[PDB]
């Protein structure tokens, strides 16, 4: 069905990816992407047949099909041959499932386009669906449902799915467990596989595909190469599954829900099913409404509710749905009085509605936000081929070949009748109510079928309703003002005589230390800025560190209402305390980072405290403290990991107890004593000069001395926390009992060495060789659990090796199979060929060597050097030069003394995290339990630190 008609596409003139749209007569939307500079080419395929056309008896049928569609062709009848053929050349495919789309996507190393796509076309002719793939994939879906047991957002999602019409196909169960996939069909005698051939043959083959290919060949060669390769689709004209009805058919409208959560959160959920604006994509009022609902500005509702201390956080806006209907959700957080004043909160919502009817539609907001989306669509660098292509393939079904780029980031007209129209849809007639509280006991009877949460309808009486319509007035509400944060800085600065690929120390004081590099590759007017604020007193005790955390938190929260337009404009930032000090990040364009940052320094320099705000934040993080008794044992294990492998560490218990004495005069008295004397080190990157960077730094520290008379630190109080030496052959372990969870955790750690050039490649190569056999035998074959991780530990200038496994086993049994995997690797040493060696180190080379794909990416790596003070900018080529000088016997000699069981250099330590009620193995030595970790470390030496490069 080879048909083509196209022309020039309005393509947002910064991309170099050459495009062409065309629609094939067999119902295939085709987009041609041509970027002849890309290393990796890609492709994506969407089928508009979704998970709403499933049979009513079997849930998640299309899910199990698109799993099983993967395995088996008539050309290659082997089981993993497509997947293993993508395992060869580093291409990571994935697929997902939606009510109206089913989408397929992959990538490839360089040229495997024709190869992999020929492996992919067969899928439509002959999928195989053999015994073993079936019987293991149903176990994989059941384990996916099992790990999706405790994710509460899907529980609330299904609670939306279940509290509507139980006849409407919105009431289906999306993923489907063991019970619905293979328990209802075989007790009814229905073959799942014949239904799979039914589904695939009748539904898929006709039309409604949406393909896109990122190829790097030309506009025409790849075009008549794949469009020749895809003529296999034959039209049957399957109709588009759309719904002529909404799923909330006035049985569950004007209704309330009372939810018992699994985590201790407090929320209120308001939902509006709303008609279709997919045809109204041209003006698209819903993005403007989503701008106006969750807006934070002068005289706003949320400004007042934060200002009254009633609302911690909120989110509202449009939820996408089916083709016929769409949704509108409002999800807000609750305080103590937020818990008691819920109806008045709804009143405040209606006050904002009264404000919206009072001022009607607005145009200057629409042109202003239109210009913001203009600039933001205007200037895009490049993209990740994954996630993007799945999104635009989501809208490839809905948009013409020129509208697939200009997707929603351009709006023709203003429709105030539409705004008023959906404003009329947003009424107490249309409200769905869901209350989330853990204080619901004995009162919520109706239990969930799959997961088991419990709720009650208990409809609102009519007094409050009629009270809701007549009492519609305004108080101290104002419309938010025009932004001023719009830049006209668009000028890219040409590179100067100071041509460096790495940031130079352009400013050194005893107060500061400043490193700088401008954008060589990406050429954007934007800039990224990284800042550490060093202070000695940060980790002196729990008490003041808590005060720092609360200080930084409520501090950041203060200007946040002002910060909303900047983050809304594309100016992102970060404030974060560390064990060392504070972490600042500034990311965005070049316009007003000095100006705004000046306001930031003056704000956190000169700050005042409210009393009840202090009480809420103090109590709120106090609730966040004893939450930490209940989390996942891997997170718990990483806690103990970073606990044991530092110099000093304050536990959560003494963090809980020490907040009993925290008064505000004590706090506000300590802070300027704290803030009296500190150090700042900073990385600045983007479109600027060196001298303007000096002025920004000068500005900052000037302001600092201006307010708090900051003087520099001593180079004897420039310290780090050290890492603990071991007695070179010893193995100690201890246990911790998890109260709640029935799973057990364990983590095993190895102190190799400092980061010398040899040890980096030792640990990387050893890490690479243990990935796939552990992947093959332990999780897959031994079926221990899902949490099975290994890897590096770059900490305190000391490299390290760690193994993270959490499964429900006896831990010494689990140790036995760990050591069994160690012996397995021991034999797998001598089983390495030369070829496996060479291809394996080439894999690690291309894994390590890559140019960055984001300015933030390389900045996080560089900043990771800066926090470790290493500065070895060309460690990559150095390590590769070492990497080429490595033998098999090198890692034998690395194994025998350092890694083997007969080792005089053995630095091995394990940690047990117990459960709620908790082919050859040698005689391991006896460890000892660790009752006092300080008294543990009492006779352990400390490591030196690194001479900085």
UniProtKB/Swiss-Prot annotation:
Record-listed N6-succinyllysine modification sites: 147, 652
Cofactor comment text: Binds 1 zinc ion per subunit.
Tissue spec: Detected in brain and in cerebrospinal fluid (at protein level).
UniProt enzyme class: hydrolase
GO BP term, pick one: bradykinin catabolic process
UniProt cross-references to InterPro entries, sorted A to Z: Metalloenz_LuxS/M16 (IPR011249), Pept_M16_N (IPR011765), Pept_M16_Zn_BS (IPR001431), Peptidase_M16 (IPR050626), Peptidase_M16_C (IPR007863), Peptidase_M16_M (IPR032632), PqqF-like_C_4 (IPR054734)
Positions that bind Zn(2+): 63, 67, 144
Reaction catalysis annotation: Degradation of insulin, glucagon and other polypeptides. No action on proteins
Effect on the protein of changing residue 783 to C: Increases catalytic rate towards INS and amyloid
Family matches, as Pfam families: Peptidase_M16, Peptidase_M16_C, Peptidase_M16_M, PqqF-like_C_4
Residues given in the record as ATP binding sites: 384, 850-856
Keyword annotations: Allosteric enzyme, ATP-binding, Cell membrane, Cytoplasm, Host cell receptor for virus entry, Host-virus interaction, Hydrolase, Membrane, Metal-binding, Metalloprotease, Nucleotide-binding, Protease, Receptor, Secreted, Zinc
Activity regulation description: Activated by small peptides. Activated by ATP and GTP, and to a lesser extent by CTP, TTP and PPPi. Inhibited by bacitracin. In vitro modification of Cys residues impairs enzyme activity.
Obligatory cofactor(s): Zn(2+)
Keyword Oxidoreductase included in the entry's annotation: no
Family per similarity comment: Belongs to the peptidase M16 family.
Note: ATP-binding induces a conformation change.
Described function: Plays a role in the cellular breakdown of insulin, APP peptides, IAPP peptides, natriuretic peptides, glucagon, bradykinin, kallidin, and other peptides, and thereby plays a role in intercellular peptide signaling. Substrate binding induces important conformation changes, making it possible to bind and degrade larger substrates, such as insulin. Contributes to the regulation of peptide hormone signaling cascades and regulation of blood glucose homeostasis via its role in the degradation of insulin, glucagon and IAPP.
Domain notes: The SlyX motif may be involved in the non-conventional secretion of the protein.
Protein name, entry field: Insulin-degrading enzyme
Organism: Homo sapiens
